[PDB]
Amino acid sequence: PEPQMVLSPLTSAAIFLVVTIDSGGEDTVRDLLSDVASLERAVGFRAQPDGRLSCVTGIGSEAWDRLFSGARPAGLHPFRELDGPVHRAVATPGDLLFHIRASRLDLCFALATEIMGRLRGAVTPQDEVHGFKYFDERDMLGFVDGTENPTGAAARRAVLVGAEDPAFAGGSYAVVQKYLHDIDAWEGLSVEAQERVIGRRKMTDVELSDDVKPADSHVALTSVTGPDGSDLEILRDNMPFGSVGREEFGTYFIGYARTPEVTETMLERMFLGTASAPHDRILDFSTAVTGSLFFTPAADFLEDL
Amino acid sequence: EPEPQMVLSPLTSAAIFLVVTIDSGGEDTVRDLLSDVASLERAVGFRAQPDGRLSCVTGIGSEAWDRLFSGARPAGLHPFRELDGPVHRAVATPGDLLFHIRASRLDLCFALATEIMGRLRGAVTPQDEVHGFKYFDERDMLGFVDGTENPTGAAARRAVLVGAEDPAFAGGSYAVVQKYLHDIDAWEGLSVEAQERVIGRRKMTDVELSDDVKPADSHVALTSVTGPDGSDLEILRDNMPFGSVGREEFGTYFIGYARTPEVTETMLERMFLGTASAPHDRILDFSTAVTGSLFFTPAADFLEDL
Amino acid sequence: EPEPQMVLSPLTSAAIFLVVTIDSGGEDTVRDLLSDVASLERAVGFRAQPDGRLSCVTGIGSEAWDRLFSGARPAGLHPFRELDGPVHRAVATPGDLLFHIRASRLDLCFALATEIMGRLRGAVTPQDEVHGFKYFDERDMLGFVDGTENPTGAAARRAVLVGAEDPAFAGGSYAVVQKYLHDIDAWEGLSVEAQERVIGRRKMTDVELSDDVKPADSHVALTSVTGPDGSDLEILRDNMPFGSVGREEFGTYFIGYARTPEVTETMLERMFLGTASAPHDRILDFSTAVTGSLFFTPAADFLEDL
Amino acid sequence: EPEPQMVLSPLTSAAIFLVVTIDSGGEDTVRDLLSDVASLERAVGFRAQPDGRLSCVTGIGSEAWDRLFSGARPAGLHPFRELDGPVHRAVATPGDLLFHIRASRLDLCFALATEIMGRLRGAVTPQDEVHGFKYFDERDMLGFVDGTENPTGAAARRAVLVGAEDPAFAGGSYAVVQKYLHDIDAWEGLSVEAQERVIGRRKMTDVELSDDVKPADSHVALTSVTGPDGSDLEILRDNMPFGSVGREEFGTYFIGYARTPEVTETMLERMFLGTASAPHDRILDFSTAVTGSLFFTPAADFLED
Amino acid sequence: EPEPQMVLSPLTSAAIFLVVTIDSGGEDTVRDLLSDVASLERAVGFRAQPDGRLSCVTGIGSEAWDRLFSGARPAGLHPFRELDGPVHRAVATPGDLLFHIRASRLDLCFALATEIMGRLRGAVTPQDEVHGFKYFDERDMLGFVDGTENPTGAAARRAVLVGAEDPAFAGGSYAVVQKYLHDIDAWEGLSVEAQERVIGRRKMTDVELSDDVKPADSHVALTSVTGPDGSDLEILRDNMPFGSVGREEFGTYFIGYARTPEVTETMLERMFLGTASAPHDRILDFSTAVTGSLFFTPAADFLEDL
Amino acid sequence: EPEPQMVLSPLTSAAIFLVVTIDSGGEDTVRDLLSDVASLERAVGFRAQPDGRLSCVTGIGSEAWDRLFSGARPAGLHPFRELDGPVHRAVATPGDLLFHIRASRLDLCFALATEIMGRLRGAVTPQDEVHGFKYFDERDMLGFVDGTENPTGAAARRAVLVGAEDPAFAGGSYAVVQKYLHDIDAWEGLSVEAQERVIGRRKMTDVELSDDVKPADSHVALTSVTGPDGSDLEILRDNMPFGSVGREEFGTYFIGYARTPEVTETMLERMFLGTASAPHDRILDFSTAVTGSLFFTPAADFLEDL
Numbered sequence A: 001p002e003p004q005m006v007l008s009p010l011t012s013a014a015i016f017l018v019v020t021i022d023s024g025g026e027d028t029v030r031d032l033l034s035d036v037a038s039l040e041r042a043v044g045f046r047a048q049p050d051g052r053l054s055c056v057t058g059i060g061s062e063a064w065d066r067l068f069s070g071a072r073p074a075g076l077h078p079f080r081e082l083d084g085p086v087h088r089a090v091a092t093p094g095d096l097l098f099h100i101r102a103s104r105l106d107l108c109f110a111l112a113t114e115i116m117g118r119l120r121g122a123v124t125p126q127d128e129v130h131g132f133k134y135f136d137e138r139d140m141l142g143f144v145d146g147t148e149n150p151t152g153a154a155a156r157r158a159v160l161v162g163a164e165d166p167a168f169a170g171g172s173y174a175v176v177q178k179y180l181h182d183i184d185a186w187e188g189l190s191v192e193a194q195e196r197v198i199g200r201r202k203m204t205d206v207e208l209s210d211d212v213k214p215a216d217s218h219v220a221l222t223s224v225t226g227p228d229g230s231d232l233e234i235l236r237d238n239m240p241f242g243s244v245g246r247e248e249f250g251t252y253f254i255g256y257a258r259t260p261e262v263t264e265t266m267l268e269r270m271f272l273g274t275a276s277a278p279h280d281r282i283l284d285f286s287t288a289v290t291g292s293l294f295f296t297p298a299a300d301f302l303e304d305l
Numbered sequence B, C, E, F: 001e002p003e004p005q006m007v008l009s010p011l012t013s014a015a016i017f018l019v020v021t022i023d024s025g026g027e028d029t030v031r032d033l034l035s036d037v038a039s040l041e042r043a044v045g046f047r048a049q050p051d052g053r054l055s056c057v058t059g060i061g062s063e064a065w066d067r068l069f070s071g072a073r074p075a076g077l078h079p080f081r082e083l084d085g086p087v088h089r090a091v092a093t094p095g096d097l098l099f100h101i102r103a104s105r106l107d108l109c110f111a112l113a114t115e116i117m118g119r120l121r122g123a124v125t126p127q128d129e130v131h132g133f134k135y136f137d138e139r140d141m142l143g144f145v146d147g148t149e150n151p152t153g154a155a156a157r158r159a160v161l162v163g164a165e166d167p168a169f170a171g172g173s174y175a176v177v178q179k180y181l182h183d184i185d186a187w188e189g190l191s192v193e194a195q196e197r198v199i200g201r202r203k204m205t206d207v208e209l210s211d212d213v214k215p216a217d218s219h220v221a222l223t224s225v226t227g228p229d230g231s232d233l234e235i236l237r238d239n240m241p242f243g244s245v246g247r248e249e250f251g252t253y254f255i256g257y258a259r260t261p262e263v264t265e266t267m268l269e270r271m272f273l274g275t276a277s278a279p280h281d282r283i284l285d286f287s288t289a290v291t292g293s294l295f296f297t298p299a300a301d302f303l304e305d306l
Numbered sequence D: 001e002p003e004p005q006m007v008l009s010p011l012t013s014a015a016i017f018l019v020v021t022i023d024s025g026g027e028d029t030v031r032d033l034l035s036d037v038a039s040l041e042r043a044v045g046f047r048a049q050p051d052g053r054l055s056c057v058t059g060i061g062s063e064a065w066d067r068l069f070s071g072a073r074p075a076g077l078h079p080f081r082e083l084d085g086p087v088h089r090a091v092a093t094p095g096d097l098l099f100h101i102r103a104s105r106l107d108l109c110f111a112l113a114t115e116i117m118g119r120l121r122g123a124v125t126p127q128d129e130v131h132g133f134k135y136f137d138e139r140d141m142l143g144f145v146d147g148t149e150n151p152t153g154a155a156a157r158r159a160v161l162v163g164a165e166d167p168a169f170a171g172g173s174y175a176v177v178q179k180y181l182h183d184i185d186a187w188e189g190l191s192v193e194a195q196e197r198v199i200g201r202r203k204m205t206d207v208e209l210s211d212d213v214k215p216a217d218s219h220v221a222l223t224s225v226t227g228p229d230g231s232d233l234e235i236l237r238d239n240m241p242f243g244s245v246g247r248e249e250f251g252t253y254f255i256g257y258a259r260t261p262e263v264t265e266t267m268l269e270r271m272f273l274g275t276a277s278a279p280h281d282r283i284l285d286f287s288t289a290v291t292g293s294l295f296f297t298p299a300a301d302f303l304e305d
């Protein structure tokens, strides 16, 4: 079973499109899903091999039940809201996700145009973010973002559904959150204080050692080991976005994993805290304004419709 | 002696256009920023040399000029003139400062825009912010190659930079901006041959239609002007696509630089008001202007001294 | 595995196709060159890593096979079969050896071709030499993107490489070549919408025309065949433009690789002989085949051991 | 005043040389094409920026100049003069127009050549068409780096562009072309040391042989000329390999630009006819000229009218 | 797989080779660093993706192995064995740890080397540090292309990586290093043809000399070994030039990886000790080895768990 | 101009600095080499155009100028002056000739350096040889962006090239070199905020600290000097990191070019001797100068003519 392009090369541009399916829109949607791979080739092939255009399509829980019948992915549910003492992770509507990536924005925009052209009148846009790599893989807080992502076989094993849910092997679960940062507040910290929030050094991206890294740093709370001692990992492809006029500086978070349990555990630790940590310090400078969960099927599941 | 801003830029694949108004009381903050904007361009850009190709051209409008400076005004500076054609209208919208930021990548544009606006918050109000990108092989949203007949090298220097005619402001230029939104559904209902008739060139190969066959209300026909002496009058354009798929906005951000606005304004009159043989530029049947402003972009040394 | 030749190449922008026949007495010289051709590919190409992307696929025809080797023949190897259609003909021309040389620049191709022909001088007679070049947006001589639907990765391995069905020759492939000359004047008299109807895809955007609108005598319609499996039958193509402006020759060099010739031969029957609903492939109204040959491209290890 | 044609071009790895004669009656068609060839160059080349580096230099021969124009002639314009040397001969062959088309890739060259010949069909007859390719380390067909001592910047402007000495035609240049075919088997039978003695420079490192060991009949010896005041007389060359393996043609297409043909012609006389010290240029013992033509390449403004 | 280190790297144009010994008492510090060396490679290299191509391969010597680790030893690990030939000698020099750091640019190599040595200061003593750079056409200091016949893809995986013959260490490899200094004055007194006879390949075109002309004491002749197997025994080399023009040092840093040291050691014996028809490798008449060590480069996973 | 040497070079990422003394008897060898150094630069560089960007700038010291040439001296040419400050000292070390070799890759640098020193064998004695590499965002060894405020374009020509003040030597420049070694352990114990106060710019963003917070003893404060008119006096710098990890050498090789050495010497006096308001440049608390020389780099025409 061929997976979608969840494991992509590093790409410098992305469009994230989240839509809801209008009443009556189900058939239009199904026809599009069966064509999305061929549109990806048509737009992408003439810019090979530099273009690295790919589109990962995801389907939400309530939408899955309107479109298909029979067996469902084992872990597919609506994003679970987290009501922490201080910080909250909201859930927002989203039936379909298009995660469109390439080495240039225009390829992204051309593919998005074709997809929404086929869907006009069946869907309603909920979110559209045009993302860009910032410098040397930095995010909007000025830290390198991506460094501890798994690679190669460790990545395939962390992100692709296997034997545990055989009918959906080759699929993945994507969680999306749009975050806005309070840059004024962040920039009032010293660099050393910022490093204590993230858990790594700013200029060199070296992890802080275990004897200085705080329990409420981001890296501390998103490190999770499983009952057998192995690391529980996700694949992230966070993108900066913003608008200077509106003072909007953002990180669009997207995390892929073989089951939503992994991602959800990390989220609980960040928002709700642990025995030793009230919450992830990064949330004192970052507000989530969207939250959705999607299942990204194997490519063959979409071809056969 | 005088160093121009980077009006004549290499081809760049990302741009930010920022148009603001100066609030009451903001003038001093703005003047400090103008004198530092070249420094900020170096601070952001130098670490990404030589690939980055970051430049910022700063432009000042007619009313803002009188609030900011006294003494001489550049000879051609006035407010953008609204054009009320029989069918199509070129609006004038508010604009005191233009920052036309270009680079080979968006992040550098954004980083410089962030630094500029960081110094100016409290003193200005944003009116328009567009993030532009190059689309394929220099194509615009209508699917045609865009820029082909721009002047280059010495001809560009001569068409764009103020010289002896206004010696206090030699090295400056005049910029006209209009944000255009396209009706892509209408446009895509035309055959390719019909689209070529609107533009005046071939779509795939970008070869100009012969005199034999080019309509008089084609875009290329209307924007070709020879001056009293018989030589052509040229501008320098760096149009950028922009858009949002969910809102159905597909746009062209027009910016044209010229040594005097009279050239740009004549082209605009022809397009909106027509000629004896052409009611209006057919491109306007698929393109609506929603902003319009005119700025003077001084020589770099003018700004350095404040 | 055994190591296949570089049938599955990265995208390359230049090629040389060489077709020769083996003269009387030439077999020994040929067999020496075959055993060294991989090391000549590395000699010429290694110093130009990693941009060079130079490869050479060597193929052997049916008659030549029996002069060169004894023991088993590959299952599918036979002379190219002439197709005498009502209107269009697929001709057969002589060819014992194919060198399909690809790289990112012509000079590398030429350098390797020079070395190969150097070793063969006086053993072979050239029948065809074509210097091909890809247009800058993967377009062909007709102006359409060419390559889009080729299979990739595991699907390509499955469609192209001989496997368990003929185990002594696993890792090999079958190559069909035809040189096509186009009538560019005729083709350029069609509208874009008409040309799209001949091909089956949009010219500018390369999106496939939908099933409800794509004519049955369009190229894409006729070269889509499903097997008994239900699954599509695929080939791997690497068509290359060529020509000469002084002689008015504008051409497409077709080369198609498949795990058995039955796939390629079916497509050719459909194009040249037609189906229940289509007289012939409309592309042949603008394209004439003037060569036709079929080769087996053995696994690299087969050649190394001689 | 005058914008020259793109005589001083960036390094380009591909070229098409097209030489045609103007048929009886063809003069008007030619004139119309000349006035448009700059705009064809932009049409084909602009969309391939900035990599494409497409340019076309157009040149006109002496007899054709008389058919096309009246009024002033360029001072230096005359038909190529045959050299009948004791051993080697430089032939003169017909040609009224030259298109010297250059780019980073052959297809751009071909696209522009196609447009040009399309407009000239029926008015001209092709005499020569060569598709050139530079080897990857600026080597020529003989394996030597080719172009090392070309002038650059202001030295090149001084050497190639007509100035105040012929002010009606300032910004123009004179092009000489010769197609050479090589005897590769003879050449490859020389040791490297013997080859270096023919050329005048070291083969692998491209360092010039010192004055005390460079032969008098080496190529570099004979093509170094000083003028009355003792300064070097210089040309700009853009020699391209070409060939066909099937027909055993291995060639160098010579093109030299100079502000007057006297410089190029003197170098040619030294090569073909000899000096007191040297019977002839040793490179001609491996190279035969099979065309020879001379053209004036006007300032681009001259063609715009 | 277990995950190997990046033994099979893309082509890289810079390297640092660092050889250190472990001071007594330093073993715990070293074990900590080995468990973090992969994360340091990512911290330094991630921000420079994808062009940076920084990798670090870490190798452990025989005696160090015994001081550092509990369990079983790799089967092939021993001290480098001195070779005392009639004319030329391969010396064995001290080395407990090898860091073979490669990238597209020296700065990344240096930055990683700095971080590694930062953690080791006080626990190790530097024995050798070489900053290598590739000549622009993959040439070495003798002017010959270097790397041409290395194995590729699956053939490389098979020649370099320990498999089920030593299953606890599958995914490891064995590295041999020797620093060579050349007598450039002597070498440059040879004609090109005589140099070609020492190496066994053509200097300009890198084509192998034919079997009837290639000397038996040529480098290529001596380092071509067939196994008991019938077939070729291969190693993977990544030789780097280095030097200092003031000191007249012009060098080649030899590094060879193999799945067992037997292969590399055979080649070395042939070079230094000779064969029936060759006294020794002629290259050694212009090259003096001044270091020599052997290391085991474990699988990535082995190091992660310490 | 007469044609200057390549003092104004593009950004390059590698360099070799070679400083030598002329031995007795060496004068004529040196003179021959000077007249050929441009042609060596082309021989090594041409075949790697235009990616290579190889240049060599050749400079001559005061004492050596008198040995080599008769006739006029450059007005500004004198031995580097030692500065014996209360705390820090700028040493003067011997040097007759400087070769400042720059390119995009080290191997081109090394190849040209090899040719130059090969011609000078036996006539000169090497005093200093440094191989420099740029860190990947134009950062130096202290982690700051280095080069931001260098002049460009006509401002650079005006700052660095001799003109009509010394018309015989128009086109020349004056280069000062100093090799510095850094105390990295001390530097890394400062907070980033404290480092910024040493340099005078922000570390991450490279923005200049504002006049109200920048300390008087910061590097930027002390190296800003205004001339009689109130304009900035500028130099052109191309500082290069270098180092050796095993020897714990981390260095900055300083090279500054100016039209007269008075400008560079003023800056050095301020840094090392201090002013009324600054004891000395705080960068010297982390940087020790171990060489110091001054050279005149003539116009290229001057070297051709002999």
Ligand code: HEM
Binding pocket: A139, A141, A143, A144, A145, A146, A147, A148, A149, A177, A179, A198, A200, A218, A219, A222, A223, A234, A236, A238, A251, A253, A255, A263, A266, A267, A282, A286
């Ligand atoms: C709010 C915006 C976010 C920002 C700006 C951000 C930023 C960062 C940065 C700079 C790192 C260190 C470098 C790296 O390894 O990539 C990192 C690591 C990580 N983040 Fe986040 N992050 C955000 C949200 C999240 C969320 C919501 C999750 C999980 C649900 C998450 C999971 C991770 C994980 C798993 C790691 C790697 C930890 C390890 O070293 O083992 N991040 N993030």
Ligand code: HEM
Binding pocket: C140, C141, C142, C144, C145, C146, C147, C148, C149, C150, C178, C180, C199, C201, C219, C220, C223, C224, C235, C237, C239, C252, C254, C256, C264, C267, C268, C283, C287
């Ligand atoms: C006469 C010159 C030829 C030209 C100029 C040409 C051009 C094209 C073009 C433009 C496409 C559509 C884009 C793509 O998927 O590549 C295409 C598709 C194809 N062509 Fe051709 N073609 C030629 C001859 C042939 C021949 C002789 C064959 C088979 C023997 C063939 C087999 C195919 C196949 C199999 C496809 C893709 C079908 C699918 O869409 O699933 N072509 N060709």
Ligand code: HEM
Binding pocket: E140, E142, E144, E145, E146, E147, E148, E149, E150, E178, E180, E199, E201, E219, E220, E223, E224, E235, E237, E239, E252, E254, E256, E264, E267, E268, E283, E287
């Ligand atoms: C001074 C040291 C060395 C230099 C300058 C050098 C240079 C070269 C050159 C120029 C080639 C031919 C091109 C190629 O295939 O890469 C080559 C091949 C080779 N060298 Fe070396 N080499 C050196 C040391 C060694 C050593 C010490 C070994 C073995 C322990 C070795 C093993 C080989 C092998 C296996 C080949 C490939 C032979 C084949 O199958 O063609 N080299 N070397």
Ligand code: HEM
Binding pocket: F140, F142, F144, F145, F146, F147, F148, F149, F150, F178, F180, F199, F201, F219, F220, F223, F224, F235, F237, F239, F252, F254, F256, F264, F267, F268, F283, F287
């Ligand atoms: C250890 C030696 C050095 C280091 C690591 C160093 C580093 C730097 C850095 C980081 C900057 C700020 C960015 C820039 O504009 O380049 C700078 C500026 C500067 N440095 Fe240095 N520097 C060194 C030595 C010197 C010396 C010895 C001089 C003068 C003789 C000098 C002259 C300058 C000048 C003129 C500026 C720019 C001032 C203006 O900002 O308008 N540097 N240096």
Ligand SMILES: [Mg+2]
Binding pocket: A182, A183, A184, A247
């Ligand atoms: Mg705020």
Ligand SMILES: [Mg+2]
Binding pocket: F087, F285
């Ligand atoms: Mg002190």
Ligand SMILES: [O]
Binding pocket: A236, A238
């Ligand atoms: O993250």
Ligand SMILES: [O]
Binding pocket: F237, F239
């Ligand atoms: O500096």
